Amino acid sequence: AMIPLFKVAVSPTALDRVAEVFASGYLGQGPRVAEFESALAARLGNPRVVSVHSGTSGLCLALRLLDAPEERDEVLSTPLTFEATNWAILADGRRITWVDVDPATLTMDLDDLERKISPATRAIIVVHWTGYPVDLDRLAGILDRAEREHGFRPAVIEDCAHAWGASYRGVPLGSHGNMCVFSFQALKHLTCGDGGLLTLPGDELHERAMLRRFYGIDRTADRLRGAYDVAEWGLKWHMTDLNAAIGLANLETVDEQLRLHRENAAFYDKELTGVPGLELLQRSPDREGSFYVYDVKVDDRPAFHRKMEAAGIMAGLVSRRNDEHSCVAHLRTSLPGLDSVYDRMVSLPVGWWLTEQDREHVVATIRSGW
Amino acid sequence: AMIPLFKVAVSPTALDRVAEVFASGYLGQGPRVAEFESALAARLGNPRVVSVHSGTSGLCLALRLLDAPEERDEVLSTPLTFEATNWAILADGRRITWVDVDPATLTMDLDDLERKISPATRAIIVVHWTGYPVDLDRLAGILDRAEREHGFRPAVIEDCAHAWGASYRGVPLGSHGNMCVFSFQALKHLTCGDGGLLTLPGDELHERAMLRRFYGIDRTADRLRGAYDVAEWGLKWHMTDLNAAIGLANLETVDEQLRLHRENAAFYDKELTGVPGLELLQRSPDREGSFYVYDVKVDDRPAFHRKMEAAGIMAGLVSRRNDEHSCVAHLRTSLPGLDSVYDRMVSLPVGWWLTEQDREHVVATIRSGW
C-alpha cells in the first residue's frame, strides 16, 4: 500500500452536481460559476474574485492586467516552483530574473529580491511554496523603498496554488493588497478538476479581469447584434459551470481536509525533531500554512529515498528547479541559497488521506535510520 | 419558445462516462484522452492529433510551434471570425494584417491574401467560416509563389472550429498539409464541454506539440526525482480525462447531427430561392461544409431582424467583425469586400434541433416578407 505524496479529493457529491449541469443544458460560464464565486468570496472576505480556467490561466491574466511600458521587461521570480509560475512570464513576453531561495523557509529570499529590483522590474511573482506564506509585510516594505528609489512600485502577484485556506498575520491570503492566484487543479486542496481563482485588490482590476478572462467580451452584451466592443483583448481564461459544479461539491469538506493536513504537519513537527541527518523547516507562528506537502532537509538523500521507496512512501520533489531547464539556459545566474538546499530537500506525504497508521509508519521508518 | 441559432449537443451517455472518470480517481490527462485521440485519429485519417483545452489553446499552441524570425511579425487573418482567432495572434506577440472577405462566400478573399503577403509575413490563419471550407489548393499555390519570391514559405493554420466533419476535394479537413485546429466548445458540433484538437502535417511538429501542450514536460518522466528537461516552454494547453470522457460520449451521434445540419441547409437552398431582398450564398460542389449556421444576405436587415424576433427565430451575427474593436483601432484597413456585405449578412438556425415544423416556419416567415 503506497502512501502517495498527492491525492485527488473529489466528493461523492460531485456526480450529482455535474448531473445538474448536464440536465440544465448549459455547460458554459453561467449560474454555477456565479454560485461558486459567491461562496469563495464569502470564505475569502474579498468580494473581488474572478474564476478562471486554471491557476496557470490566472497567472497569465494577472500579468496581462499590468500597465507598465514594454521597456519594463523584467519579472522577478524564484525557480523553486512549479513550471507554470515561470512559463507564464515567458508567455507574457517578459524576461525572468531569478531570485534566490531562503534555505530556512524554501520560499523567495527577500534580501535577494530587494537587491535585484531594478528600473526594468515590471512585476514580482511570489510563491507561497508548499503552502507556507511569504512574509508579505516585509515584501510591502521592500516595495515602499523601491518606489521611493525608482519612482514606481512593481506589481506583486501571489501564486497561491499550494495555499488554499492559508493566512498571514490574521488575514486570509487574497486580502493583503496584491493580486492572488489560487489553483483548483485535481491535486490541490480544493479541486474543480481544473480551475483557479484570481483575486483583485481594487475595482478597476476586478472589472478588467472579468472582461479579459473571456476575450474582453462583455457577456451581458447583445452579441447577436454585434453590440459590444473589446477594449482590451483576452483569451479563453474563464471557468465554466461544469468545473464550478465540481468545486461547489468539494467545498463541503475542504475545511476538514485542511485541518487534517495541519494536524499531520503538527504530528511530524513533534515526532521528527531530534533525528540525526534530518532538519525541519522552522515556520513562523504569525501565519498559518496549508501544507500541500511537508518538507524536510536530509543528509544522504539517496539513501533516504531508497528507504522511503522500500517502505512504500512516496517522497521527493514537486518539480525540478526551473532554472536548470534548457529552454532558459540563457537566464542562468548564481543562486547559492537554493544550491545549499536543493540536494537535501525532500517532500513528504502530509495530506488528509494519511491514516494515523500511515503517518506513524512514515515517522517510524524515518526514525529507524537510512 | 424561440428557435435558437446555437444549441448544446450533450449525450445522455455523458454522465455515465463522467462517472467512470470520477470512480477511477484520475481526473488528469490519462487513458480517456488517449482513447479520444485514437478515435478522432481514425475518423480524421490523420494519426498526428493532439487534444487541447480549447480551440483557442490549439491556436495559441500552433502559433508557438512556428519557426520564423521576430522580424517576420505579421500574421494575415480576416476579421470575419470569432475573436479567438485574432486574439490568439495578439497574445502570441504578433501584428495582425487584415485580409478582406469574398462577398460570394464570406470566407477570406484569396486575391487580397496574395496581394498582402510581404517580407514580414509570418503565417496565415484561414477560417472555414460557418463550416464552409476555404479553397485550400488555391491557397497552396499562392504559397508556392510566395516561397519562390521570398525563400520562406509562410505557415498556414486552419481554424476549423465551425467545420467538424467537413471535407475539401475528397479529403477530410486535417489532411491537406496544414496545421488544423478543431473546437469542441459546448455549442460546436462535437463537444467535450470545452476542448479542441490540433492536427499536425508532420512528425516533428507532432512531437513538439505533445510536449508543449503541457509546459514542455514529458509526462512519462520521473518528475519526483526532477529527471526531466523542458527544451521549449508551454502552458496548460492540454485536455484532461473529464472532458475527453464527454467527447467520447458525444462521438456516438455527431454524424447523425451533421447529417441533419446538411439536410436543413439543403432545404433552405431549395426553399429560399426567388425571395425579394434575400441573396443566398453559392457553395462549390467540390467540398462538403458543416453548416454551423446558415448564412444569407438581406436588404433592410433591421426590418428583417424585427421579423425574425417576432416569429421567435434567433437570427444575427456570430460575432462583431473583429477589426472594429477598439483594442485593434491601430490596425484598421480598408476592406471594401467585407463592407459590401457586413450590413446585409444574417445567420439562420440550421442545426439538428430543428424539427421539420421549425424549418418550415423559418422559410414561411422569410417568404412572407419584411
Report the gap between the CA of B231 and the closest CA in chain A (Å): 5
Inter-chain contact B223–A19, Cβ cutoff 8 Å?
Answer: no
Q: What is the resolution of this structure in A?
A: 1.5
Inter-chain contact B223–A320, Cβ cutoff 8 Å?
Answer: yes
Numbered ranges of CATH 3.40.640.10 in chain B: 1-253
Neighbour tally for B162: CB within 10 Å: 25
Q: Tell me the residue type at A71.
A: E
Q: Please return the burial class of B7, using the count of CB atoms within 10 Å of its CB with bins 0-12, 13-18 and 19+.
A: middle
Q: A7 an active-site residue?
A: no
Catalytic residue among A7, A116, A188, A270: A188
Q: At A236, is the secondary structure helix, strand, or coil? A: strand
CA angle A292, A296, A298 (to 5 degrees): 150
The DSSP H or E segment spanning B198 is: strand B196-199
- Find, among A242, A151, A325, A211, the residue nearest to B234 by Cα: A325
Q: At A154, is the secondary structure helix, strand, or coil? A: coil
Q: Which residues pair with A316 in a beta bridge?
A: A347
Inter-chain contact B325–A230, Cβ cutoff 8 Å?
Answer: yes
Report the gap between the CA of A209 and the closest CA in chain B (Å): 15
Numbered ranges of CATH 3.90.1150.10 in chain B: 254-370
Report the gap between the CA of B217 and the closest CA in chain A (Å): 9
Neighbour tally for B39: CB within 10 Å: 15
- Find, among A134, A171, A172, A129, the residue nearest to A156 by Cα: A134
**HSE-CB for B263 with a 13 A CA cutoff:** 13
- The three cell numbers locating residue A313: 512512501
This entry's atomic model was obtained through X-ray
Inter-chain contact B15–A14, Cβ cutoff 8 Å?
Answer: no
Nearest CA in chain B to A348: B224
A116 annotated as belonging to a binding site for a ligand: no
- Find, among A123, A113, A27, A118, the residue nearest to A67 by Cα: A123
Residue A178 has what DSSP assignment? Answer: S
Q: How far, rounded to the nearest angstrom, does the alpha carbon of residue B174 sit from its chain's CA centroid?
A: 12
- The three cell numbers locating residue B245: 470522457
8 A C-beta contact, residue A124 and residue A107: no
| Separation of first and last alpha carbons in chain A | 21
Radius of gyration for the alpha carbons in chain B, expressed in angstroms and rounded: 21
Q: Which residues pair with A172 in a beta bridge?
A: A167
Looking only at the bridges linking them, the beta strands covering A167-168 and A171-172 are: antiparallel
Nearest CA in chain B to A302: B225
Of A14, A236, A319, the CB nearest to B22: A14
Distance, in Å, from the CA atom of A84 to the CA atom of B236, rounded to the nearest integer, reads: 8
Sequence-separated contacts (24+) of A301-305 with Cβ below 8 Å: A301/A343, A301/A344, A301/A346, A303/A370, A304/A346, A304/A370, A305/A346, A305/B225
8 A C-beta contact, residue B97 and residue B74: yes
8 A C-beta contact, residue A50 and residue B53: no
- The class level of CATH for A1-253 reads alpha beta
Q: Could you tell me how many residues make up chain A?
A: 370
Nearest CA in chain A to B61: A91
Catalytic residue among B116, B188, B270, B307: B188
Inter-chain contact B325–A229, Cβ cutoff 8 Å?
Answer: yes
- Find, among B140, B243, B241, B136, the residue nearest to B188 by Cα: B243
Using a CB-CB distance cutoff of 8 angstroms, which residues of chain B are in contact with residue A17? none
Q: Which residues contact A302 (CB under 8 A, 6 or more apart)?
A: none
Distance, in Å, from the CA atom of B288 to the CA atom of B98, rounded to the nearest integer, reads: 26
Of B83, B225, B315, the CB nearest to A230: B83
Distance, in Å, from the CA atom of A46 to the CA atom of A53, rounded to the nearest integer, reads: 20
- Output the DSSP codes for B57-70: HHHHHHHHT----T
HEC states along B245-305?
HHHHHHHHHHHHHHHHHHHHHHHHHHHCCCCCCEEECCCCCCEECCCCCEEEEECCHHHHH
Using a CB-CB distance cutoff of 8 angstroms, which residues of chain A are in contact with residue B51? none
8 A C-beta contact, residue B366 and residue B278: yes
Distance, in Å, from the CA atom of B190 to the CA atom of A113, rounded to the nearest integer, reads: 49
- Output the DSSP codes for A9-50: ---TTHHHHHHHHHHHT--SSSHHHHHHHHHHHHHHT-S-EE
The DSSP H or E segment spanning B172 is: strand B171-172
B183 annotated as belonging to a binding site for a ligand: yes
- Find, among B70, B86, B84, B177, the residue nearest to B122 by Cα: B70
- The three cell numbers locating residue A123: 512585476
Q: Which residues pair with A95 in a beta bridge?
A: A74
B55 annotated as belonging to a binding site for a ligand: yes
Q: Tell me the residue type at A152.
A: F
Looking only at the bridges linking them, the beta strands covering A196-199 and A179-183 are: antiparallel
Distance, in Å, from the CA atom of A154 to the CA atom of A144, rounded to the nearest integer, reads: 10
Q: Which residues pair with B8 in a beta bridge?
A: none
Using a CB-CB distance cutoff of 8 angstroms, which residues of chain A are in contact with residue B22? 10, 14-15
8 A C-beta contact, residue A297 and residue A279: yes
Residue A326 has what DSSP assignment? Answer: G
Distance, in Å, from the CA atom of B113 to the CA atom of B96, rounded to the nearest integer, reads: 13
Q: Which residues contact A177 (CB under 8 A, 6 or more apart)?
A: A140, A201
Q: Tell me the residue type at A350.
A: V
Q: At B362, is the secondary structure helix, strand, or coil? A: helix
- Output the DSSP codes for A278-309: EEEPPPPTTEE---SSEEEEESSHHHHHHHHH
Looking only at the bridges linking them, the beta strands covering B155-159 and B179-183 are: parallel
Distance, in Å, from the CA atom of A236 to the CA atom of B288, rounded to the nearest integer, reads: 29
Strands (E), chain A: 49-52, 74-77, 95-98, 121-127, 155-159, 167-168, 171-172, 179-183, 196-199, 278-280, 287-288, 294-298, 345-348
Q: Which residues pair with A238 in a beta bridge?
A: A52
Q: How far, rounded to the nearest angstrom, does the alpha carbon of residue A188 sit from its chain's CA centroid?
A: 9
Inter-chain contact A223–B320, Cβ cutoff 8 Å?
Answer: yes
Using a CB-CB distance cutoff of 8 angstroms, which residues of chain A are in contact with residue B224? 5, 314-317
Distance, in Å, from the CA atom of A83 to the CA atom of A85, rounded to the nearest integer, reads: 5
Strands (E), A49-120: 49-52, 74-77, 95-98
Using a CB-CB distance cutoff of 8 angstroms, which residues of chain B are in contact with residue A88? 235
8 A C-beta contact, residue A53 and residue A194: yes
Distance, in Å, from the CA atom of A32 to the CA atom of A53, rounded to the nearest integer, reads: 14
- Find, among B5, B2, B7, the residue nearest to B187 by Cα: B7
Dihedral, CA atoms, A51, A52, A55, A56, nearest 10 degrees?
A: -160
Distance, in Å, from the CA atom of B150 to the CA atom of B124, rounded to the nearest integer, reads: 15
Classify domain B254-370 by CATH number.
3.90.1150.10
- Output the DSSP codes for B288-355: E---SSEEEEESSHHHHHHHHHHTTB--B-SS--GGGSGGGGGG----HHHHHHHTTEEEE--STT--
- The three cell numbers locating residue B199: 492536427
Integer CA distances (angstroms), B10 to A26, A35, A92, B245, in order: 10, 23, 35, 12
- Find, among A192, A218, A182, the residue nearest to A84 by Cα: A182
Neighbour tally for A352: CB within 10 Å: 17
Neighbour tally for B138: CB within 10 Å: 13
A183 annotated as belonging to a binding site for a ligand: yes
8 A C-beta contact, residue B245 and residue B21: yes
- Find, among A364, A366, A302, A358, the residue nearest to A1 by Cα: A358
8 A C-beta contact, residue A316 and residue A305: yes
- The three cell numbers locating residue B74: 505579421
Sheet bearing A167-168, strands edge to edge: A171-172, A167-168, A287-288
Q: Tell me the residue type at A87.
A: W
Strands (E), A202-323: 278-280, 287-288, 294-298
Integer CA distances (angstroms), B43 to A277, B38, B48, B164, B165, in order: 58, 9, 12, 11, 9
8 A C-beta contact, residue A167 and residue A43: no
- The three cell numbers locating residue A162: 499550494
Using a CB-CB distance cutoff of 8 angstroms, which residues of chain B are in contact with residue A27? 8, 10, 186, 191, 193
Distance, in Å, from the CA atom of B183 to the CA atom of B54, rounded to the nearest integer, reads: 6
The DSSP H or E segment spanning A116 is: helix A110-116
- The three cell numbers locating residue B6: 446555437
Distance, in Å, from the CA atom of B11 to the CA atom of A22, rounded to the nearest integer, reads: 9
Distance, in Å, from the CA atom of A7 to the CA atom of A317, rounded to the nearest integer, reads: 15
Q: At B232, is the secondary structure helix, strand, or coil? A: coil
8 A C-beta contact, residue B249 and residue B16: yes
Nearest CA in chain B to A301: B225
Nearest CA in chain B to A305: B225
A188 annotated as belonging to a binding site for a ligand: yes
Radius of gyration for the alpha carbons in chain A, expressed in angstroms and rounded: 21
Q: Which residues pair with B199 in a beta bridge?
A: B49, B180
Q: Tell me the residue type at A9.
A: A
